[PDB]
Design a protein around this ligand. Structure first.
Ligand SMILES: [Mg+2]
Ligand SMILES: [Mg+2]
Ligand SMILES: [Mg+2]
Ligand SMILES: [Mg+2]
Ligand SMILES: [Mg+2]
Ligand SMILES: [Mg+2]
Ligand SMILES: [Mg+2]
Ligand SMILES: [Mg+2]
Ligand SMILES: [Mg+2]
Ligand SMILES: [Mg+2]
Ligand SMILES: [Mg+2]
Ligand SMILES: [Mg+2]
Ligand SMILES: [Mg+2]
Ligand SMILES: [Mg+2]
Ligand SMILES: [Mg+2]
Ligand SMILES: [Mg+2]
Ligand SMILES: [Mg+2]
Ligand SMILES: [Mg+2]
Ligand SMILES: [Mg+2]
Ligand SMILES: [Mg+2]
Lengths: 217, 93, 427
RNA sequence: GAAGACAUUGUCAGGUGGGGAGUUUGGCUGGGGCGGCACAUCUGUUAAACGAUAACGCAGAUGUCCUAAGGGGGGCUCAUGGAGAACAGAAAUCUCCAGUAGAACAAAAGGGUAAAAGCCCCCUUGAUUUUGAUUUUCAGUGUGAAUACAAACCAUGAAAGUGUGGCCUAUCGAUCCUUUAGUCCCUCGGAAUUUGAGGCUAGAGGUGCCAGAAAAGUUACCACAGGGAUAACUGGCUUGUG
RNA sequence: UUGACAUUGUGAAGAGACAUAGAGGGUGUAGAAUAAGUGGGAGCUUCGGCGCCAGUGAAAUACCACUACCUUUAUAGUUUC
RNA sequence: GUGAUUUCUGCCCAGUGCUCUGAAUGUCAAAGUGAAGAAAUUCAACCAAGCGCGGGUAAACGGC
RNA sequence: AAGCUCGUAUCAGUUUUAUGAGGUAAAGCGAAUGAUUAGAGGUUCCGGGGUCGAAAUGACCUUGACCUAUUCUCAAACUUUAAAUAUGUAAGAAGUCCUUGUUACUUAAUUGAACGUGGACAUUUGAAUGAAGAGCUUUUAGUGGGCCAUUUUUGGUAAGC
């Protein structure tokens, strides 16, 4: 929606950050996600819109991106200390059909080589895109550590058959004003992505991954 | 045709008066009903008995359109317009 | 480009999810697996449904239009590497260790291989299988009349079976020599070859080019084409070598004792070079830049000893006089300078006492005794004086010690950096 | 007796409505019509050695394409032939010699170009702002396209320089009406504030019949105002022999 | 021809849409199983209570996480027919 | 509409018409309803017949 | 038609002298371009498309790609040379020379560029012949169907086409 004097979200973020670790000092699982449900739009009758609105603020540090690439980016991935893959390894992955549906679950994402990604379309077969894990390409001269940071901090709004899109927009760690900036950026991106720029958005909720009863949005 | 969405050109704002950086979008249009003098005149001429009273054009010959770019200054927020030739496919990659 | 035409798509695995999750209680009386496969295919092979029987009288796994139509039709009508585990075992049975050779003839007349219904790339990969066997040792080969006018499938056998000694290939069907022309310096130690009743063996060149094809041949088709009694002493060494020898056995014992003592002391701390050498006992040190043949086993490619080159008193290395005069050894002070010039290295002689090879002798001009030992010297640590560090590198000490009642006193103190490889001690 | 706050009647609104009314039903053209566009444009020829010059003359093109295929700089030489090199066989990769362009430069044709205008790289946005003058068509009007300066701001290059889109010759559009950008802008006339509206300067939305109406047939039942049609004479042809 | 308003007064029953609250539905062949749902979700609870790693699955489960509607109720009202 | 008597008038409802013992929002005007606004207004839902979907009809026009 | 400002101008449907531009006639092709026409096969050297197809070891079609081992042959849309006829400019007083004034332009500069002050140069003041006065302004009529002849040409066997 058109923005609505975000002190209510400020008090909601303060109540959420006093819910996490000040009434339940649990183990380190900080992810203050924003769930947004849209109203007054038909999925089949309207266009299924999508975009990615990558904010550099990060909240999910433990991620799995099995870098699939060639030899030079394999050495670059071994330098960047992340789980890589080889060409014969990916050939065996396309050989065993049950291994792909499991490697899509043991990983959290993916990051491909601008020299082998125009094949993951067919070699690494379907259900990777159905699990929404189509790999993003990385060039022969871009920074692999920076690309891994971007693929860990890149959020994407996609219109499915349901109107209940939720995104890991923040962590419950700290930085109230930076969290307010993140909430403003996410609300701006959703409002600009929807067809009517204000009217369609109905439900906004904050939850710090703990089934907390503090939304107040 | 491909045009990038960033461009350094001259802006004539009173603060800048030099070459600055702009971002690029495409131009579109609107309309108005209980406002404009032409519509308010046409509706009264159209009411009553008499028929249609104005011409109606149905002999279109062009198949394409010129494209206009709107440039917004990042340091001034002063827009500017620039027209291009006739093309069939346009994007801002 | 790369792996492209793997065929993981085009109706094989993708777009196979058009199923319909309805009430699933279809008309189903008898549709089980064996009778279904029999009533579907009595003339060819077929591809079956996902999960379709009539055991529970319910079926909804006909995930396509023609699948659902055939299911409704039979509802409305009443009805009712992997070859390596045998190939390598056959090859290991063919490599009898008693005869020390394998026979690969007449495989196209053996029912264990005729009904298997498979030859050229099979034998060219069977060379790789026989090289990766490594425990079914076979020296010679017996593959007469192998149904080839050329030698394509037996081309890599010369590289894979480099201990060839004989071959019987008679009743051949070859009419050229260019297929055998690649066998120069390849299976050239073999000493018997005959492929008669053929246009490759009944030609003129069979006595002038066969010796070139096998220079080391002590026989030629149940004959002798070379002086095989003298070839063992002319084409090879006349006598063996001695990995440890001296003028006397007790001389070699004391020489090896003082050599191991000096090597252990130089490994622990060489700070007492001034106390090990006298005022006259000088030294020398040099490095070996160039290397031997590239096919030498575990051979250092280049002398990576770039922190010891300035104090190398080598004659033909540097062209100056004052440079070798400054890099050369005076008494105890410059002896300790040469001792701390190079990289300190614990002696790899106690691991391979065999490869630590030491000769010895006496010195009649001073009633002394000399010992030239040579071993490895692997340097974990280096010289603390200011590509940089060492590599796999050897060393050789040619000392000349004159004994007394107390101990022995050195006269020559040599240092030699080299390129490490295998030693001439082993068999 | 029957019916009953429903029908009926009044006003507005949506369908239906050749039963009826009014009107229209392009131009060029070996007659009209069909076909075509010779209706707005470009190259060679017709075209007769300045310029101009017709035909439903001839051979063809246009309503596009390009963030580089625009701008600056650096290095290099193209088509082709010959002699050589394992597999190599018209033809795969490498080496040398010859090579005035026989290649390439988006598209038709003509012109132009070799330490380049071609090919390969590097940096960029001058395809920017403000307005006058000039050339072609020409009434020396408009539209389109182009040329040379001025006043700013930039790019590139060591620099001199060059750069106001595409190496040159084609690639496109008024009034009225909508809409957009810009002016701590002007007006709403009894006086103010805020919406709304109207103006000024510069672009887009289009008229291809391209100086730019909003448009189907038939008449032998026909009407009006006018203009044109009739023996063979080649300024001299016709008879027996492909 | 169809709708609205007016002509136009006096009564009574029924069937429906909107908010507040309550739990129900996620059964195909499979996998114990009641998974065509959406991304968090690896550690929380004497309780191990399912997890990930086991496996079947297309989708796997703790913390019941958000939209829901689809079959369901109860309140008074607005209006309908 | 056909055109005394005699004799024969086959098959197609698909196209265009004409029609309706059929389903339910697909299109859906004024009036009324709701939301935002200082208000003029703007947005949204609901929505009659008709059309559309579905059925009938050839001594209807047609078609073979 | 009405005139107006002036009085032999510096002008010409022309020649001469000087100096440019052109690519037709003729030459020449054979010096590089030398052509339409009916022109035989060589399939994984190309293949344009058109029909089917729960799709690709994918079937069904025909113009043509390329003339392959064919040359003489000639041009209004081919070039090396190149007339005649027709065509642009100049032949001075608004000129030339000497000297030195202005400028915010230009030069390294006291250099130039443009415009000047002062001075010198008329029997010919810069080839011929002619000159019915020269220059300028306002306003308005009719016309906007043409035809014939020599020569040079385009399309139609060709015509008073
Ligand atoms: Mg009206
Ligand atoms: Mg009534
Ligand atoms: Mg009518
Ligand atoms: Mg009429
Ligand atoms: Mg006409
Ligand atoms: Mg005609
Ligand atoms: Mg001319
Ligand atoms: Mg260019
Ligand atoms: Mg003009
Ligand atoms: Mg316009
Ligand atoms: Mg016109
Ligand atoms: Mg016109
Ligand atoms: Mg008449
Ligand atoms: Mg019908
Ligand atoms: Mg309405
Ligand atoms: Mg209706
Ligand atoms: Mg001629
Ligand atoms: Mg003077
Ligand atoms: Mg006139
Ligand atoms: Mg007339």
């Amino acid at each position: 929606m058109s923005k609505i004097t975000s002190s209510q979200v400020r008090e909601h973020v303060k109540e959420l950050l006093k819910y996490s670790n000040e009434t339940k000092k649990r183990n380190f699982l900080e992810t203050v996600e924003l769930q947004v449900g849209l109203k007054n739009y038909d999925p089949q009758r309207d266009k299924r819109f999508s975009g990615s609105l990558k904010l550099p603020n990060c909240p999910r540090p433990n991620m799995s991106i099995c870098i699939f690439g060639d030899a030079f980016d394999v050495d670059r991935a071994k330098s960047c200390g992340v789980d890589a893959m080889s060409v014969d390894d990916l050939k065996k992955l396309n050989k065993n059909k049950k291994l792909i549906k499991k490697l899509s679950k043991k990983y959290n994402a993916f990051i491909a080589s601008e020299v082998l990604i125009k094949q993951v379309p067919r070699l690494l077969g379907p259900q990777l895109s159905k699990a929404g894990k189509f790999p993003t390409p990385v060039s022969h001269n871009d920074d692999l550590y920076g690309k891994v940071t971007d693929v860990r901090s890149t959020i994407k709004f996609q219109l499915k058959k349901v109107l209940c899109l939720a995104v890991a927009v923040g962590n419950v760690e700290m930085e109230e004003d930076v969290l307010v900036n993140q909430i403003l950026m996410s609300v701006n991106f959703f409002v600009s992505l929807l067809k009517k720029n204000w009217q369609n958005v109905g439900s906004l909720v904050v939850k710090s991954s703990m089934g907390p009863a503090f939304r107040l949005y | 045709v491909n045009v990038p969405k960033t461009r350094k050109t001259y802006c004539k704002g009173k603060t800048c008066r030099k070459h600055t950086q702009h971002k690029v979008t495409q131009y579109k249009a609107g309309k108005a009903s209980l406002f404009a003098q032409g519509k308010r005149r046409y509706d009264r001429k159209q009411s009553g008995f008499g028929g249609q009273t104005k011409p109606v054009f149905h002999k279109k010959a062009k198949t394409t359109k010129k494209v206009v770019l709107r440039l917004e200054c990042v340091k001034c927020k002063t827009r500017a317009q620039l027209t291009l030739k006739r093309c069939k496919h346009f994007e801002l990659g | 480009g790369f792996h492209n035409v793997g065929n993981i798509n085009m109706m094989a695995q993708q777009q196979m999810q058009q199923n319909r999750i309805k009430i699933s209680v279809r008309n189903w009386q008898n549709a089980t697996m064996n009778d279904l496969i029999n009533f579907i295919s009595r003339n060819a092979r077929v591809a079956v449904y996902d999960a379709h029987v009539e055991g529970p009288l319910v079926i909804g796994y006909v995930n396509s239009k023609a699948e659902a139509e055939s299911l409704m039709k039979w509802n409305g009508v009443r009805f009712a590497s992997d070859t390596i585990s045998f190939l390598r075992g056959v090859l290991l049975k063919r490599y009898d260790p008693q005869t020390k050779l394998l026979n690969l003839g007449a495989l196209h007349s053996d029912p264990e291989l005729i009904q298997k219904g498979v030859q050229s790339k099979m034998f060219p990969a069977m060379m790789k299988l026989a090289s990766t066997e490594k425990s079914l040792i076979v020296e010679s080969v017996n593959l007469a009349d192998n149904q080839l006018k050329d030698i394509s499938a037996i081309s890599t056998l010369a590289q894979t079976f480099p201990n060839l000694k004989n071959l019987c290939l008679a009743n051949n069907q070859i009419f050229r020599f260019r297929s055998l022309e690649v066998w120069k310096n390849k299976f050239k130690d073999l000493r018997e070859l005959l492929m008669t009743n053929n246009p490759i063996t009944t030609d003129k060149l069979y006595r002038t080019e066969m010796l070139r094809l096998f220079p080391k041949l002590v026989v030629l088709d149940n004959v002798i084409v070379r002086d095989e009694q003298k070839l063992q002493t002319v084409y090879s060494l006349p006598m063996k070598i001695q990995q440890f020898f001296f003028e006397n056995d007790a001389l070699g014992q004391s020489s090896t004792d003082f050599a191991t003592n000096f090597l252990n002391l130089w490994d622990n701390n060489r700070e007492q070079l001034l106390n090990l050498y006298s005022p006259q006992s000088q030294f020398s040190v040099s490095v070996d830049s160039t290397i031997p043949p590239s096919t030498v086993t575990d051979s250092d490619q280049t002398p990576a000893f770039g922190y010891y080159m300035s104090s190398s008193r080598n004659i033909s290395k540097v062209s100056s006089e004052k440079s070798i005069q400054q890099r050369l050894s005076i008494g105890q002070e410059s002896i300790n300078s040469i001792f701390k010039t190079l990289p300190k290295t614990k002696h790899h002689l106690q691991e391979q006492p065999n490869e630590y090879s030491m000769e010895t002798i006496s010195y009649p001009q001073i009633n002394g005794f000399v010992i030239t030992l040579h071993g490895f010297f692997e340097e974990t640590g280096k010289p603390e004086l200011e590509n940089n560090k060492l590599s796999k590198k050897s060393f050789d000490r040619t000392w000349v010690i004159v004994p007394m009642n107390n101990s022995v006193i050195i006269a020559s103190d040599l240092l030699t950096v080299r390129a490490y490889s295998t030693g001439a001690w082993k068999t």
